Ligand binder design. Sequence first.
Ligand code: HEM
Lengths: 341, 343, 216, 218
Amino acid sequence: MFLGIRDIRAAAGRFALIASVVGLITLLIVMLTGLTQGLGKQNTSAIEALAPHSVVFTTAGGSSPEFTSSEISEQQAERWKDSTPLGVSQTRIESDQNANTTAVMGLPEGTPLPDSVGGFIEQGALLPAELADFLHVRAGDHITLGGATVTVAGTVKTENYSHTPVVWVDTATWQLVSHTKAVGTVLLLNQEPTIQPQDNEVVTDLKGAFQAMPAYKSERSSLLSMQAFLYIISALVTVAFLTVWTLQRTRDIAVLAALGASKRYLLIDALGQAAIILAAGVALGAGIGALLGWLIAGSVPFSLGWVSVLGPALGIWLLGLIGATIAVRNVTKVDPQIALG
Amino acid sequence: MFLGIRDIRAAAGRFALIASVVGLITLLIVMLTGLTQGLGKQNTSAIEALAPHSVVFTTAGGSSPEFTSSEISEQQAERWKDSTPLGVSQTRIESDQNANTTAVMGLPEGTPLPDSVGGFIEQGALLPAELADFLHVRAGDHITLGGATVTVAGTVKTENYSHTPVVWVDTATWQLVSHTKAVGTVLLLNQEPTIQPQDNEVVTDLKGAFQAMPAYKSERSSLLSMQAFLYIISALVTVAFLTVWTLQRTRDIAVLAALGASKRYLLIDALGQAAIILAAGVALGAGIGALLGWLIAGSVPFSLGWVSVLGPALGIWLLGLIGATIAVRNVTKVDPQIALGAT
Amino acid sequence: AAPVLSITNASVVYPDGISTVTALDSANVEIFPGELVAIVGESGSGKSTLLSIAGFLQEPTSGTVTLHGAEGLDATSTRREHIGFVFQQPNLLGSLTAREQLLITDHLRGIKPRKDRADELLARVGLKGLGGRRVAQLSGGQRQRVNIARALMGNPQLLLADEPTSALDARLSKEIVELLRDVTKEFALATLMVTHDRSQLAYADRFVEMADGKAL
Amino acid sequence: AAPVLSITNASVVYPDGISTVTALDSANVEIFPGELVAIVGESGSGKSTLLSIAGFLQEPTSGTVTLHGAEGLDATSTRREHIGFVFQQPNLLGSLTAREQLLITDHLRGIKPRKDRADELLARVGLKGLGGRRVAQLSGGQRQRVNIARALMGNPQLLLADEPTSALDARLSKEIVELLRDVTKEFALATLMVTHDRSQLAYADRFVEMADGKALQT
Ligand code: HEM
């Protein structure tokens, strides 16, 4: 570890070029990670907030359940006991001052809302605080919701469904706004189902309930695949560079071997140098990453925590260490007679 | 170029490692490039087919125009002459056998649709053939569209708006499905705008009209930004690798220099070796890229042409050549006396 | 009254391309504390091969080499604790300073680097106060002087010098051999010195002549 | 009566760390076609410095070095067209075959590599039919023989050999010096040969003794 650290001091140029490349890849991975979690919460934050155990859908032609095509009839709701019908629709909201499209969720009156949202289901529509400010609307003003005039029951926090904020209304109001005789679009089960489902019914877990959303799986999967390739590319970049680099030190490594340096010493030296270089690159990339993400989290959906920046960072660094040992393996095979020539 | 090409033949191992990294990065870039172009048409393919010259929006509080908030009043439409009202909404479609949500575009009755889409605006809704197959609905069957039962007037080609297929209906029908007395959401202008707009009105070109789409700008920009990082990462990877590599040949380069090899020869030798490696890496990476993309373009939106695979591929290869020359610059600065002694 | 190194009937055979070549042929050499034994002979007579054998840099293909006080130790551990190498080229690590060239041997031996000892030895080799010089600030003779000091850092009982005056003029090469002989006597080292300049035999206690891998 | 190479009062001073160093001090040497001139002296006396000067590998800090027939040419162009180097180490490129070690010189000279000449020369150096061997399959003597052949590919006027017998036993080193003498005479080459072995001066027409960068001459 003695020579390795001082090689870096005296040749900071060469390592800066490579460390920047490692830093860029970590920057891309850290920011891609935050964007995938941000988009994931943009689609699931509302359903996840409600924290159901199982979710009953309705299908056609035995196809996979879809939130865009499922409806729960009143009798279907009475079948599943200890369950509440949830209506999920997206429609146009229009105020006296502005308008936009938003998601509308409907639940039975009096159902307590998750602490993420707080309050309880009231008669009428509960608007997200940001949406009420956008429309220049206050509590008690009339608004056109899906072609029907509804009274704003109050303001609430913002949750999301399919990249839209969730407007919370009573089950009766949702039926008028979504033009359906059904009591809901899905059935939320908080306990484990003790009844067997019908031919047209299907029970699903919270995870699988997200896959019933159109954009979620087909867009998170593609983002995850990019992350997997990026982790692989980082590992190969380190291995590719470090193999060629360790070959450059053969002469200095041979001299230490001739002097009596054990194989353990030479391997620790090489891996120590790589670990410091990889640490610098990853720290700078993840540092710049969290900063750019926080700077961008206003224009683009970006979820930024400690695990979403440092999780990938530590993963990349450990991938680099595994890659580095693979590249430094040949430091112990250097014949010490290379120094006598 | 003599030594450079034969170095690769006899030591194919190390070059395979680096060429794989270059191929992987090109693989990632090729699909990201195609995916950004594919999603762009997924948001704009319908409007692009109509090919308007200018587009008039409606705003509130002088904010940026948004397709989710624009409506054109009937008298407002009479002001701008030589204009066609376009209604754009997304709502739920339900058939006797199935249902789903889709985008609905409305135009005045009888207006001929662009040859991209063909047919004419008829009373009722013209459904995409693929959606009708999913719903098990034929010509003459009743379907529930946004809470209203409408008869299928006929089939048309498939265009997309906000990741949804476009159902084409007459201006009257669209009002019923969108629950509005307005005659449309935007106005398509085929001629030059000769009327001045009001403080609350805004005319925009076809490109700027896409910014009024919610997902388009915020998602194409992010995809393009990722591609920019990938191009930079590719260039840096080659420069980083090639600098250390050329330092490895100092001894062999010195021997050729000592023998009398000109500076051009050593530099041409070095760049020839690098160019061959970059070509191999990019060709193999872009090859697997187009293959996986065509294989996947059925489940995920992926636009795959010749320019969308070879444009970026050739760009990366040229970026690599620029990086390589920067890294091989020191091949001509090696003194041949390194060969007379020991190193 | 006790030898440091004993090479008994040692021979080395390297695979010269497709065939084999006998480099060292039944070498017999024994060195006692305080001796400077030179190895003379033309280029390619087996001098370097004998040196590498004496430094445990390669085992002989036949015969045995015993360094007393290091019995029961692998080849590498023997070099680290009992042998100091004065390579033909100074073999100074580029990124280290003159003083650091000594400390790194202490570090690879697992002891806290001794700055005072390094400066004392650098002064003993006639580089007092130059511990801070880098390789770019060292002359040919100075680098060779640092090399000698590095061989002395671990306090070995066997000092092996491989033509350490090959890139030095007559004046400078005298100083290095005088330094080598003086250090050999002062620290009771057993030193093998390979050289082709027969003008340096006057400073050696004994010499071995070599031809075609056979010692005379 | 017409020298190929003329080193007149040539001197080289390298920067030896903080100070400088006169590696060659006013050397005067002339080599004529067909001569094998040995340069003898201890290690570090200025033999290699004189060789590097004669091989246009570095200009002297003072004095002039002239290769006749190549006047008006840069340093590199002179080496490519008029000099053949028998380096101390064979300096064979690892990825090339025996014959390719010769052909690559033709390629760097801008001529389609001539295999016939490459094979003829390989035969003359005693490697007939070994053009397919790789460096890993070549012994010390054989690698040095390829080096001689590579120096002969370009039909040079000056052949410089830097102790080409340093890693060869007595038997092999005789063969190599004989080959150098024989090739020098057969191709009317002018050959400077630096050597530390005093046993090989018998093969040289003349010899220059050197000490501390000064050539001794009566
Ligand atoms: C701000 C950035 C982004 C935003 C706002 C966004 C928004 C959207 C929206 C709105 C949808 C359709 C869902 C709906 O309309 O309810 C969608 C689908 C999709 N997105 Fe994005 N997206 C972004 C970035 C990305 C990125 C970076 C990727 C891949 C790297 C991606 C891949 C996809 C895919 C594959 C789909 C599904 C396409 C389909 O089958 O219809 N998106 N996204």
